[PDB]
Design a protein around this ligand. Structure first.
Ligand SMILES: Cc1cc2nc3c(=O)[nH]c(=O)nc-3n(C[C@H](O)[C@H](O)[C@H](O)COP(=O)(O)O)c2cc1C
Ligand SMILES: CCOC(=O)/C(=N\O)C(C)=O
Length: 366
């Protein structure tokens, strides 16, 4: 029997199988408003008892660094998300909204009034990386503005309000994007965070921001509706730490403590496999070390296949396995994995284009 199709209780959510739609930015949410195309896309991939995580979603007007990504900070956005959540729920799926602030991984073109993006630091991403522009060219990451503690508290409140908005739209929960060199990771990683106040220096201080964000959303909507994504070891946007495993374990310790204090477990911890990039024994052991340390559900992501996902669940390395690129090109990926049916190729050229159909909803079913 296939271990990916054993049921799993993710808190109060009864999942029928362990194949998860990973969060993926696709840039079809024109003008940051969820569009009907998103409803068709998520409906195609929804299954009864299956778990879906949305594309990263803006928590505020300054949180974007990609074109046409959805927000959930306005009532117009909430109204349009509600239509998408309804069609997914009609298929029996569980769906979480990923809350995403890019921090310094932005550009004047994505910021109100062309202002500088915000970060923990004034250090820019280096010129080894270039940002996708709305016209399909690539631009230069600018120097960010380093925020003070008042502004940090405002950003935490943006997460809190967005979590409440997600519940209003009908989402089952939210995921905190704390990975991949974006705003939260710019506080976590000692290769970025050069602060001398209470949010920088020590490992404890670098973990303060993610702790406050998670506590804020747990207080607002309940721990069992909150997932947290991190990537202590990742090659993306100059987000390195001198001791990735200790960083990961410090975050896990904080999450365990939040659960004890709240008297409830989070929905899950979601960790990117260090092998995953946008453009091996030590890697696997880092994943298992974090899993063994965390008191709760563990989702693994990054480079998984049918065989590797089966291995992960069978060996106890993870409870759930999220798939990205193969879910782009296989709307019925869950069914194909169950049947061991051949998978369709994906076309990177249309990952981030705006067409509501081409490269988005026109990948065929079996
Ligand atoms: C087009 C694309 C967009 C992505 N956008 C996000 C995102 O918005 N938030 C996030 O946490 N991860 C994002 N990722 C990472 C995926 O969630 C996932 O971890 C990765 O695709 C899994 O590896 P796989 O593609 O080999 O399955 C993205 C990946 C792709 C390919
Ligand atoms: C390389 C890791 O970064 C990602 O996967 C991502 N978002 O988190 C995007 C928008 O591609």
């Amino acid at each position: 029997n296939n271990p990916l199709f054993s049921p799993y209780k993710m808190g109060k959510f009864n999942l029928s199988h362990r194949v998860v739609l990973a969060p993926m930015t696709r840039c079809r949410a024109l003008n940051n408003i969820p569009q009907a195309a998103l409803g068709e896309y998520y409906e195609q991939r929804a299954t009864a008892g299956g778990f879906l995580i949305t594309e990263g979603t803006m928590i505020s007007p300054t949180s974007a660094g990609f074109p046409h990504v959805p927000g959930i900070f306005t009532k117009e956005q909430v109204r349009e998300w509600k239509k998408i959540v309804d069609v997914v729920h009609a298929k029996g799926a569980v769906i979480f909204c990923q809350l995403w602030h890019v921090g310094r991984a932005s550009h004047e073109v994505y910021q109100p009034a062309g202002a500088a993006p915000i970060s923990s630091t004034e250090k820019p991403i280096s010129n080894r990386w270039r940002i996708l522009m709305p016209d399909g060219t690539h631009g230069i990451y600018p120097k960010p503005r380093a925020i003070g503690t008042y502004e940090i508290s405002q950003v935490v409140e943006d997460y809190r309000r967005s979590a409440l908005n997600a519940i209003e739209a009908g989402f089952d929960g939210i995921e905190i994007h704390g990975a991949h060199g974006f705003l939260i990771d710019q506080f976590l990683k000692d290769g970025i965070n050069d602060r001398t106040d209470e949010y920088g220096g020590s490992l404890a201080n670098r973990c303060k921001f993610i702790t406050q964000v998670v506590q804020a959303v747990v207080s607002a909507i309940g721990a069992d509706r909150v997932g947290v994504r991190v990537s202590p070891a990742i090659d993306h946007l100059d987000a390195m730490d001198s001791n990735p495993l200790s960083l990961g374990l410090a975050v896990v310790e904080r999450l365990n403590k939040i659960q004890l204090h709240s008297g409830s477990k989070l929905a899950y911890l979601h960790v990117t496999q260090p092998r995953y990039v946008a453009y091996e024994e030590e890697e696997a052991r880092l994943m298992r070390t974090l899993r063994n340390a965390y008191q709760g559900t563990f989702i693994c992501s990054g480079g998984y296949t049918r065989e590797l996902g089966i291995e992960a669940v069978a060996q106890g390395d993870a409870d759930l396995v999220s798939y990205g690129r193969l879910f782009i090109s296989n709307p019925d990926l869950v069914m194909r994995i169950k049947l061991n049916a051949p998978l369709n190729k994906y076309n990177r050229k249309t990952f981030y284009t705006q067409d509501p159909v081409v490269g988005y909803t026109d990948y065929p079913f079996l």
